[PDB]
Write a protein that binds this ligand. Structure first.
Ligand code: HEC
Ligand code: HEC
Ligand SMILES: O=N[O-]
Ligand SMILES: O=N[O-]
Ligand SMILES: O=N[O-]
Ligand SMILES: O=N[O-]
Lengths: 125, 125
């Protein structure tokens, strides 16, 4: 969907920015610093679920560029492994949010965040 | 959800960028230059539906800044009118995509695009 590779760069950056907002805005809730409203969290995690699927096509074949580490494309299968792990952790977070239990939310939130970090540690400068 | 107003700016810019990609990538399909796959379009419009709801909270009270025209905040009720019109056009596009009819998609796509432009003409520099 990208006329030039730089359009893929801008897309994936914007997807990451939105994911950070929808993930990180829950930090006070998972720490107990803000109240837990199950319906609020369920709706927000649905948004995050949608967003969470978006970057990866824009890191696929022919999207070389930007400031990411080049192993995304030279080791594309390894990048996909990190993606799979992340997307599976997102499913667990959706299940926690759908269940309406703060304990499950806390655990799944940590699972997701560690998975974001694992990919960044390998591929983000 | 924004620690400082500039975080709202970056959020809404990123939401617009993603909306442009998910809207504009359908242009070849609505022109007939690319094939119409009803299921493909239905799925893409579901993504656009989610994205389409996201900018507005980040243009609300206390999000003054960026390069947008200041009437967003000085005339907030008028901005909300443009938003309502847009979101109602999105519902029509979702219905067209769900129906699987290219004629309806063409009409609703034009409706949405004109509504994007109407808001931009008033509030985007
Ligand atoms: C690999 C499978 C990734 C996973 C999982 C996540 N991110 Fe990511 N992110 C990735 C790369 C290679 C990069 C660098 C290139 C780029 O897109 O900028 C990033 C970057 C970000 C950014 C910065 C975006 C920007 O505007 O420059 C953010 C804010 C970000 N990523 C957030 C984020 C979150 C919150 C994640 C889990 C919910 C997450 N990323 C997962 C690769 C990968
Ligand atoms: C008002 C109710 C709007 C509607 C409807 C749409 N947009 Fe928008 N957009 C709006 C403003 C005030 C601005 C300027 C400030 C900013 O967010 O940048 C924009 C900007 C954009 C951008 C540029 C984003 C960037 O990175 O700077 C894009 C690509 C964009 N808008 C796209 C877009 C599309 C495709 C819309 C309909 C599907 C649409 N916008 C509606 C305000 C409003
Ligand atoms: O910005 N994450 O692709
Ligand atoms: O996808 N596997 O780490
Ligand atoms: O960028 N649209 O808020
Ligand atoms: O929302 N009315 O133009």
């Amino acid at each position: 969907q990208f006329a030039k590779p730089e359009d893929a760069v801008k897309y994936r950056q914007s997807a990451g920015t939105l994911m950070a907002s929808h993930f990180g805005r829950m930090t006070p809730v998972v720490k107990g610093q803000a109240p837990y409203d199950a319906a609020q969290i369920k709706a927000n995690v649905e948004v995050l679920k949608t967003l969470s699927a978006l970057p990866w096509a824009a890191f696929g074949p022919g999207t070389e560029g930007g400031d990411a580490r080049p192993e995304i494309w030279s080791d594309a299968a390894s990048f996909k492994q990190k993606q799979q792990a992340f997307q599976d952790n997102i499913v667990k977070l959706s299940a926690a949010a759908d269940a309406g239990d703060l304990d499950k939310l806390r655990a799944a939130f940590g699972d997701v965040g560690a998975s974001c970090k694992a990919c960044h540690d390998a591929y983000r400068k």
